[PDB]
């Protein structure tokens, strides 16, 4: 019996949900930052 990549999130136990949330929070933050930068670029390039 072996192990394969991407198995922690295939089980869906506690580590799977923990990893999913650790990913989602980080990328929500980065999406917020990128959206702010996109708005700033929009305004600065209107002219």
């Amino acid at each position: 019996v072996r192990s394969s990549a991407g198995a922690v999130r295939d089980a869906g136990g506690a580590f799977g949900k923990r990893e999913q949330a650790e990913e989602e929070r980080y990328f929500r933050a980065r999406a917020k930052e990128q959206l702010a930068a996109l708005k700033k670029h929009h305004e600065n390039e209107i002219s």
């Binding site: 990549a5 991407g6 198995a7 922690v8 999130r9 295939d10 580590f15 799977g16 923990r18 990893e19 650790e22 990913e23 980080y26 990328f27 980065r30 999406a31 917020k32 990128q34 959206l35 702010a36 930068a37 996109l38 708005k39 929009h42």
Partner: protein
């Protein structure tokens, strides 16, 4: 010839003939029924008895009821007059519109095409679905599978394909509902009537329907696939033209075969399947082929009992298909629809010499990045995104953008999502994924790519998100 029922056990009827026996697979008609009950011979038991599976309810049968021998297998009406109609396994209409008035009746049992008839030419069939076109492109005349458990999108995906390919397809089209919900059959009938492929007034119908839903006894579910296949075969040969053939699901054929095997005296095999699973499935899937006389594009929905792709039924079905699109529940939970698994889907034409080196390289880059993402997800479960190498975070970001960009809104899933259906031409999908990999979008947020057609729509959605930030 005239025989006489001598036993009735469930759906299996034993009929005794005093004259000469009827050959295996012949259709027999029970005399004394208000409706039409047709038995099909399955075995000769000796002592002039023949075992048979009833194509209808065996309620009210009496030991001794006389039976007529039609002398030929079940013969269904075939021709351009079946278009726009609905049929049983035994070919009688169930659309309450009058008799089907054809000149040709075709037996539902026939030998598969011989090896000296196979076409060896493949050319991509563009369906307008990003994931399908990119990673598991279909092919004209090839057999397509749509594996996946329950509630993942098999029916929605096949309806979307009928909406796209069938609507703008010159040739004819056949739909065989095998052991599926009757609600869905009625919904499809009405959706086609609205679209116009089924025209109840003129003779311009482009779709022929055959139904044997899950209220039918196993005998009828095990043969409605053969009835639809016979209609498609006729349109392939005599009409000499392209055909589409949608089947939903082709696991109910196997399952219905398994519900009577134990009563026919066969020892069960594997996980309680009939010993003849592979042979029974092969003698059917081998008539759905693109010979040199015609061309059937066959799309099949294949239930996977409990998401288990190693079950004998889907496992055996895998070998009969050119392209497969393994819909996955783990991806449907995430909201990515259609939930096609990009790593568990394959196609035969997916080679650099059939699609092109740009398409092939884009597809392989996407698959590699997704596999690397899967490898990283194990680490992120212990460290956290904050502790990844500044290059690995780039892989994760690209992988999530690509994961979202494969989602697409269908024109038939308006009711669920509420969005609007998009058809994405192949060049636009290749460009979108090549750009997403090349890094030309590593500043737009992930959610901009979720449920949009071409990439420019993702840019516009990101612009809207930023403005209303």
């Amino acid at each position: 010839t005239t025989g006489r029922i001598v036993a009735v056990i469930g759906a299996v009827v034993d009929v005794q003939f005093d004259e000469g026996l009827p050959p295996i697979l012949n259709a027999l008609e029970v005399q004394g029924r208000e409706t039409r009950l047709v038995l099909e011979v399955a075995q000769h038991l000796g002592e002039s008895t023949v075992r048979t599976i009833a194509m209808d309810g065996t309620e009210g049968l009496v030991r001794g009821q006389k039976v007529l021998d039609s002398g030929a297998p079940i013969r269904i009406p075939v021709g351009p007059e079946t278009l726009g109609r609905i049929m049983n396994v035994i070919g009688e209409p169930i659309d309450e519109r009058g008799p089907i008035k054809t000149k040709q009746f075709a037996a539902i049992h026939a030998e598969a095409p011989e090896f000296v008839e196979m076409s060896v030419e493949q050319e991509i069939l563009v369906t307008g679905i990003k994931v399908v076109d990119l990673l598991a492109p279909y092919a004209k005349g090839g057999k397509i599978g749509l594996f996946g458990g329950a509630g993942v999108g098999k029916t929605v995906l096949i309806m979307e394909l009928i909406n796209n390919v069938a609507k703008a397809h010159g040739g004819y089209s056949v739909f065989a509902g095998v052991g599926e919900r009757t609600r869905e059959g009625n919904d499809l009938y009405h959706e086609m009537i609205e679209s116009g492929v089924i025209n109840l007034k003129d003779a311009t119908s482009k779709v022929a329907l055959v139904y044997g839903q899950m209220n039918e006894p196993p005998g009828a579910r095990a043969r409605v696939a053969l009835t639809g296949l016979t209609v498609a075969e006729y349109f392939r040969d005599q009409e000499g033209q392209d055909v589409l053939l949608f089947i939903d699901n082709i696991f109910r054929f196997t399952q219905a075969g398994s519900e009577v095997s134990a009563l026919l005296g066969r020892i069960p095999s594997a996980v309680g399947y009939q010993p003849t699973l592979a042979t029974d499935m092969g003698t059917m899937q081998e008539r759905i082929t693109t010979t040199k006389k015609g061309s059937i594009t066959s799309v099949q929905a294949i239930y996977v009992p409990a998401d288990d792709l190693t079950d004998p039924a889907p496992a055996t079905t895998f070998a009969h298909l050119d392209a497969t699109t393994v819909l996955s529940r783990a991806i449907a939970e995430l909201g990515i629809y259609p939930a096609v698994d990009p790593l568990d889907s394959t196609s035969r034409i997916m080679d650099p010499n059939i699609v092109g080196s740009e398409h092939y390289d884009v597809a392989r880059g996407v698959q590699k990045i997704l596999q690397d993402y899967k490898s990283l997800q194990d680490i992120i479960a212990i460290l956290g995104m904050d502790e990844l190498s500044e290059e690995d975070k780039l892989t994760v970001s690209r992988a999530r953008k690509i994961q979202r960009f494969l989602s697409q809104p269908f024109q038939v899933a308006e009711v669920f999502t509420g969005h609007l259906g998009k058809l994405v031409p192949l060049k636009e999908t290749i460009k979108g994924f090549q750009q997403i990999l090349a890094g030309e979008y590593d500043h737009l947020p992930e959610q901009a790519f979720y449920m949009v057609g071409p990439i420019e729509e993702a840019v516009a959605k990101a612009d809207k998100l930023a403005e209303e930030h």
